Ligand binder design. Structure first.
Ligand SMILES: [Zn+2]
Length: 21
């Protein structure tokens, strides 16, 4: 279990981490 991406819905990064820039 790791950071969930609330943008794509994947794992290994958070939404905020996803396309932060
Ligand atoms: Zn993502």
């Amino acid at each position: 279990k790791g950071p969930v991406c609330f943008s794509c819905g994947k794992t290994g990064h958070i939404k905020r981490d996803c396309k932060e820039e």
